[PDB]
Write a protein that binds this DNA or RNA. Structure first.
Lengths: 31, 65, 168, 228, 53, 131, 154, 88
RNA sequence: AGUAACUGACGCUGAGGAGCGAAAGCGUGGGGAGCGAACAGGAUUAGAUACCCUGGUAGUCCACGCCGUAAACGGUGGGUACUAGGUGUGGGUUUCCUUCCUUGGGAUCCGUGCCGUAGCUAACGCAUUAAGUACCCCGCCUGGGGAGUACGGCCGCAAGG
RNA sequence: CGGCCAACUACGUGCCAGCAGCCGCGGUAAUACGUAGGGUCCGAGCGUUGUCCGGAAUUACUGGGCGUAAAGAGCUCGUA
């Protein structure tokens, strides 16, 4: 199939990973 | 094509001691000749390669002269 | 005489340097209502011309449907491309119960009482092809008896035999 | 009722076929033995369908019918030509224009144009116009007569078609099957017997075998012609 | 050098002779035309009509 | 592994019919022989017989083809299979091709067709459909 | 029996190999090719290139219908099953055999000022010193090649 | 695997008669001996996972054979288990 | 693979469960030639947190352990029976050309490719190594985003799964 | 009363006012907006909303699929 779907999925996963990197310390302090 | 001189009824055994039988199977640079340019079967080609490597390890053939 | 059923007019187009070139495709069913039907698919720059080509193609390819009095011999299911059409005999006086393309094909063929259902690929051309295949899957009782080499009585049920008696 | 005997066609090489690699399994029915990398055709079946093909040709041309001698491979080229000229029957030898049988109404105009060219030749109009025009017209004449040698007698349609080496001229067999015309052909060991109605198993790559088969068919059609 | 090809890619340098790589190259032409003594001019004339460099 | 010998027999018959084979050979059993005899009596196969194989007995069935090289069997289906088994009462016996086909039913009286079971007023397991 | 009689006919047919000499009769002469009848599955095919030594000879003048020639098989199996035959290589082989059986007599083809390239069916150089278009001369052979059939003549 | 002499002695000691080699008792005995040898090997080479998979296959086959024996004859199963020192 | 001496349906699949599981990554202790995330300058560019160049730390390596992910793909779950062939190649048995040297050829069992019937498919294509004809068991899907995300829970040193 | 879906014209307005179940209609000449004629379907009823079934083979037991459309666990062993 076309790689457009894979592009959407990788963008979503990348954004989630960046969010996790940004809030790692806050999650640890609240967890 | 060519003949596997070992599959014949007169096929001499492959050993790492008889150096001439191996020298006839390596090129002038000392590299092992390909199977197609020789024509021997796969098992005999592998035995020839193993014997050549062993003879090199015991300093009977040069390492790429 | 003959009856006709123009079941689908479509406007197709191909892209060229200047722009889009449009042509018209007509799917026409030609029959007599007495047991013979045919399907044609014509294409031309104008609708009436495409209809004429479809009519001549349908007349060229005729096919006799094994009617038994007023209905098909036995229930069948035909598949062509992704279109699936199931046909079932009905009691006299039921009338034609079918979708658009199926109704046109069966009315042209001359079937008066039949239950037809299309179970996929609502596209008209494939539904027509599936209906044609399902009709081609029908077998007359005499053909079955000849195939099995047994008397017609020993093969068909008494209902079909009595239906044949009244129809003749 | 065989004009030729079992020794006659056998000497030519009809029993020969093709290589084992290029064989069609559907010919196992008419295969007798495989030797020296080629298959051998049993001649008894060849006889018991050559008599049937003889009978069918007799009946067809007897009731006001016509046949077509079709063959494009050079091995059976000249043969069929001369056979047609000894019976006065349509034939094709050079090349099968795709669609003689199916597109008959269109190709008949070619015969009309050829007749017009012959009429012009009789009237002798080779100098009333430019030299280039008359040269082009002469080339068109030659090309049309070369492409359509035995087609000038095709009035309505062939009643039957005779084909050599069905594999080479698959277009003619396809046209005949589309029109329902019943094809009588000499299948080899690599052909398809489902596409031919009345086959005659045998070799077609040998000029002698093809010539002998054409002799048989021509004799059958001549006898039918004498018994109208 | 060899990977990928483009419109302006450098054309491959091809020698006049057929490649025939060292594998089974062999020596299958052995002329012995003349060894009668000659002078420079006579040798040049023997060159010229033989069309040999 | 082999789970349904009857389904295997039906598929062998179908494959042989589609390939225009004239003979089919397969391992023999009483149920297969009985359904083969039922098929022969209904005129769906030419004739069946049993040879002796290397270990057990065999079953050789000749397929029937009409003069025009067309098949005398148009369809072969297995109804009651291991897992989901189908049993029919004497009043709700199945009809195949609107009665044109034949339904094989195993009743306490042996192997019958749909019409025979209906006439004798018995029911059983609907083994297969033939048409 | 009939089976044995057919079997005898079938064994009557002979076999060949790639590289043998086969003798046959020409059935068709064509603008591009020459056919040959041997008595086997198909008629052997001789290309116009593989027909004669000279490079501008037409098949019609060299070979006529009904003639008999001895050719050599190059490839038994083509895509269409035809076997390629050549009398040019056959004459090459037979003439070369004759040539060691001479090492001599023949005619000349090419005019080089440094010698004479005699065409005895094969190329033979005679040096110009110890010897002329279309003439025939006699001398002994110096150096054969037999790979490309080249040879040097005295 | 085991050598010919070990197989012969195991078959002679555990076989039902002097000829059988595929009896479930003999198969179980041979599998148990192979399993103990493979365990002794693997106690040295801990990271030989492929032979460990082979051991798992042998264990499963022995368990299936014991299941068959216990299903056919319980007394034979008890005798075999007590004689070969197996638990489950 | 062959012999088929032996047991005599002991077979198949398998919810959960257990084990193995590329690379990257983590912990302890070693090792560190080349390569090389990060990081420095040089260069190109309007701008270069890049592509190119010069250096270069983790890492790549070894031992014992963790994690449990990949385009972990043949994007094709496991077992079985049947359905035209032709030709390469790996392994093993045997009959006939017979020199018995020889891919001689044939037969057969088990793999691994290519081309092609019937058949199947929306098409591309698959086609005896089925995506064909059928049977047994398991897993999975029910429009696209939101989202394999939030909450809760289990595992993990952590990344995270 | 554009097509599904029986039944078209004129005037007023102009990306406004508005219509609309979906597709979609309002850009001075709208059979889709508003009003008038004309027409069609029903008729003491006619439409709208809300809820359920059908059409939906769209949870496929009857009656679906997993190469590329969503779908074969990364692979084995094995308990029920």
């Amino acid at each position: 199939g076309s790689v457009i779907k894979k592009r959407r999925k990788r963008m979503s996963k990348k954004k989630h990973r960046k969010l996790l990197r940004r809030t790692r310390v806050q999650r640890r302090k609240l967890g | 094509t060519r003949k596997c001189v070992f599959c014949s009824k007169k096929g001499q055994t492959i050993d790492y001691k008889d150096t001439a039988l191996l020298r006839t199977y390596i090129s002038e640079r000392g590299k092992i000749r390909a199977r197609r340019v020789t024509g021997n079967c796969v098992q005999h080609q592998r035995d020839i390669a193993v014997a050549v490597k062993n003879a090199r390890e015991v300093a009977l053939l040069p390492f790429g002269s | 005489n003959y009856i006709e059923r123009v079941v689908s007019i479509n406007r197709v187009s191909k892209v060229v340097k200047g722009g889009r070139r449009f042509s018209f495709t007509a799917l026409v069913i030609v029959g007599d209502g007495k047991g013979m039907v045919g399907v044609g698919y014509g294409k031309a720059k104008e609708v009436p011309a495409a209809i004429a080509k479809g009519v001549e193609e349908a007349r060229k390819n005729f096919f006799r449907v094994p009617l038994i009095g007023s209905t098909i011999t036995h229930p069948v299911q035909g598949e062509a491309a992704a279109g699936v059409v199931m046909l079932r005999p009905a009691s006299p006086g039921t009338g034609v119960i079918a979708g658009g393309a199926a109704r046109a094909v069966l009315e042209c063929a001359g079937v008066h009482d039949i239950l037809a259902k299309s179970l996929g690929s609502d596209n008209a051309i494939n539904v027509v092809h599936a209906t044609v295949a399902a009709l081609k899957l029908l077998q007359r009782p005499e053909e079955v008896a000849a195939r099995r080499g047994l008397p017609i009585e020993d093969v068909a049920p008494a209902g079909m035999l009595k239906a044949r008696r009244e129809s003749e | 009722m065989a004009v030729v005997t079992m020794k006659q066609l056998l000497d030519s090489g009809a029993h020969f076929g093709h290589q084992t690699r290029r064989w069609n399994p559907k010919m196992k029915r008419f295969i007798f033995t495989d030797r020296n990398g080629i298959y051998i055709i049993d001649l008894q079946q060849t006889l018991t369908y050559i008599d049937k093909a003889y009978e069918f040709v007799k009946e067809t041309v007897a009731h006001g019918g016509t046949v077509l001698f079709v063959g494009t491979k050079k091995q059976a080229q000249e043969s069929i030509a001369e056979e047609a000229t000894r019976v006065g029957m349509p034939y094709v030898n050079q090349r099968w224009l795709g669609g003689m049988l199916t597109n008959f109404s269109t190709v008949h105009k070619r015969l009309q144009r050829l007749k017009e060219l012959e009429a012009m030749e009789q009237t002798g109009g080779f100098e009333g116009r430019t030299k280039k025009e008359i040269l082009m017209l002469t080339r068109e004449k030659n090309k049309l007569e070369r492409s359509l040698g035995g087609i000038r007698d095709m009035q309505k349609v062939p009643s039957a078609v005779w084909v050599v080496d069905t594999n080479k001229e698959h277009i003619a067999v396809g046209e005949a099957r589309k029109l329902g015309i019943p094809v009588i052909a000499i299948l080899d060991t690599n052909c398809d017997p489902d596409v031919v109605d009345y086959p005659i198993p045998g070799n077609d790559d040998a000029i002698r075998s093809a010539a002998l088969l054409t002799k048989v068919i021509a004799s059958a059609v001549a006898e039918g012609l004498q018994a109208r | 050098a060899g990977r990928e090809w483009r419109h302006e890619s450098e054309p491959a340098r091809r020698p006049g002779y057929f490649p025939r790589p060292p594998e089974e190259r062999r020596i299958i032409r052995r002329k012995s035309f003349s060894m009668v003594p000659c002078t420079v001019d006579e040798a040049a004339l023997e060159m010229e009509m033989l069309d040999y460099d | 592994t082999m789970t349904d010998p009857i389904a295997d027999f039906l598929t062998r018959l179908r494959n042989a019919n589609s390939a225009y084979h004239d003979e089919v050979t397969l391992p023999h059993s009483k149920l297969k022989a009985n359904i083969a005899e039922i098929l022969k009596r209904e005129g769906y196969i030419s004739d069946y017989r049993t040879e002796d194989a290397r270990v057990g007995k065999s079953l050789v069935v000749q397929l029937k083809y009409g003069p025009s090289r067309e098949r005398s069997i148009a369809g072969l289906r297995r109804v009651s299979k291991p897992g989901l088994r189908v049993y029919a009462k004497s009043t709700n016996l199945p009809r195949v091709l609107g009665g044109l086909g034949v339904a094989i039913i195993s009743t306490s009286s042996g192997l019958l067709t749909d019409r025979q079971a209906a006439r004798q007023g018995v029911g059983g397991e609907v083994l297969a459909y033939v048409w | 029996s009939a089976e044995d009689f057919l079997a005898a006919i079938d064994k009557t047919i002979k076999y060949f190999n790639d590289g043998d000499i086969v003798e046959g009769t020409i059935v068709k002469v064509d603008r591009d090719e020459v056919l040959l009848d041997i008595g086997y599955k198909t008629e052997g095919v001789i290309p116009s290139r593989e027909l004669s030594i000279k490079h501008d000879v037409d098949p019609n003048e060299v070979v006529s219908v009904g003639d008999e020639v001895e050719a050599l098989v190059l490839t038994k199996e083509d895509k269409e099953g035809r076997l390629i035959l050549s009398k040019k290589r056959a004459q090459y082989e037979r003439a070369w055999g004759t040539i060691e059986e001479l090492k001599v007599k023949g005619t000349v083809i090419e005019v080089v000022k440094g010698g004479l390239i005699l065409d005895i069916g094969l190329r033979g150089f005679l040096p110009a010193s110890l010897v002329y278009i279309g003439k025939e001369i006699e001398a002994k052979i110096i150096e054969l090649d037999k790979n490309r059939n080249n040879v040097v003549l005295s | 695997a085991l050598t010919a002499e070990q197989k012969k002695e195991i078959l002679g000691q555990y076989g039902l008669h002097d000829t059988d080699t595929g009896s479930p008792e003999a198969q179980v005995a041979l599998l148990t001996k192979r399993i103990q040898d493979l365990t002794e090997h693997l106690k040295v080479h801990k990271h030989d996972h492929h032979s460990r998979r082979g051991l798992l296959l042998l264990v499963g086959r022995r368990r299936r054979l014991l299941k068959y024996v216990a299903q056919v004859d319980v007394a034979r199963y008890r005798s075999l288990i007590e004689r070969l020192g197996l638990r489950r």
